[PDB]
Amino acid sequence: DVSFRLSGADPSSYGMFIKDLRNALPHTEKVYNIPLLLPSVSGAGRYLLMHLFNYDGNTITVAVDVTNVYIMGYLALTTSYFFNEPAADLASQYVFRSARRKITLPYSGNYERLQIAAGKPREKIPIGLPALDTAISTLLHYDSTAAAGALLVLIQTTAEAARFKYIEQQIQERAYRDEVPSSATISLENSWSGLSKQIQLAQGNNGVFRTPTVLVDSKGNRVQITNVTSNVVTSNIQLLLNTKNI
Numbered sequence: 403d404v405s406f407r408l409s410g411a412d413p414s415s416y417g418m419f420i421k422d423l424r425n426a427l428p429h430t431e432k433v434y435n436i437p438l439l440l441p442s443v444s445g446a447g448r449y450l451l452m453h454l455f456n457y458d459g460n461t462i463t464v465a466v467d468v469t470n471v472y473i474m475g476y477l478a479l480t481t482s483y484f485f486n487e488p489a490a491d492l493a494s495q496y497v498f499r500s501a502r503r504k505i506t507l508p509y510s511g512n513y514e515r516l517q518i519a520a521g522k523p524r525e526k527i528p529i530g531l532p533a534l535d536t537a538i539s540t541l542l543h544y545d546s547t548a549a550a551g552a553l554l555v556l557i558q559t560t561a562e563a564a565r566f567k568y569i570e571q572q573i574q575e576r577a578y579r580d581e582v583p584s585s586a587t588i589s590l591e592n593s594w595s596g597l598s599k600q601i602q603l604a605q606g607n608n609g610v611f612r613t614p615t616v617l618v619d620s621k622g623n624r625v626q627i628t629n630v631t632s633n634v635v636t637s638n639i640q641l642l643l644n645t646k647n648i
C-alpha cells in the first residue's frame with residue numbers, strides 16, 4: 403500500500419508519495435530506461451491501495467489497477483464506490499469487500515464522462531495540494547456531481563503525476579495555491595497511451611516513432627515528438643502502458 407497525508411504536506415512529502423506510488427507498480431523490464439507496466443496481473447494483486455488523508459486526518463482508500471494506473475474505486479468509512487465500467491466491477495470482486503454497502507457511481511472513469519458529470523472540462527478545474535485535500539473531503543460523503551470534479555482532481559494529482567515528472571512538478575508548484583492545469587499538462591495526459599505505444603514501437607525501429615506524437619510544450623507551443631531522444635522520453639515520462647493493453 404502507499405499513503406499520503408495532507409496535514410503538514412509540502413513539495414518534498416508529495417514527491418516522496420509520488421515516488422512510493424511509482425515504486426509500488428510492478429515491472430519486469432524497462433524500455434529505454436522507463437519501467438514497462440505488466441500486460442496483466444491476476445486476482446487481488448492487480449490492485450494497489452492508496453491511503454489518502456485530508457488535513458483533518460479523515461481518510462479514503464483508493465484502488466488503482468497496477469497495469470495501467472487507472473483508479474477503479476475507493477472506500478470511504480464503510481461504503482465503497484466504483485466506476486460504472488467492467489474493469490471496476492471486476493475490481494469490486496477483490497477490494498473493499500468488507501464495506502457495509504457498495505455504490506456504483508453513475509459514470510465511468512474516463513475523462514470525457516467525468517467532465518460531463520462535473521459540468522466542466524478539466525481546463526477549468528483548479529488542481530494542487532489544496533484541491534486534493536478538498537477532493538478527499540468531498541469523497542467522504544456521497545454526492546455524485548461533486549464527486550466527478552473531486553475524481554478529476556484526484557486522478558491528475560496521483561496517477562497523472564506518477565506517469566509524468568512534469569505533472570508531479572506542476573503539482574508541487576501548486577502545494578499551497580491551486581491553479582488550473584497548464585495546456586502542456588492536458589496534452590501529456592491525453593498522450594500517455596500514444597507515447598507509451600510509440601516508445602515501445604521504437605525498439606525495433608532504431609529509437610524512431612512509427613507515428614509522431616503531437617504535444618503542447620511548457621510555453622503553450624505545439625510540438626512534434628518523433629524519437630526517443632526527446633526530453634519527453636529521456637526525462638519526463640515515468641511509466642509505460644504495455645502495448646498489449648493498447
Ligand SMILES: CC(=O)N[C@@H](CCCNC(=N)N)C(=O)O
Pocket residue numbers: 471472473474485487510511512513557561562
Ligand atoms: C482516464 C484516466 O487516466 N483515469 C483515471 C482512472 C479512470 C478509470 N476508468 C477508466 N479508465 N475508464 C486514472 O486513475 O488514471
Ligand SMILES: *[C@@H]1O[C@H](CO)[C@@H](O)[C@H](O)[C@H]1NC(C)=O
Pocket residue numbers: 627628629630631632633
Ligand atoms: C529526434 O528527436 C530530436 C528532439 O525532438 C529531434 O531534434 C531530431 O530531429 C529527431 N531525430 C530524427 C532522426 O528524427
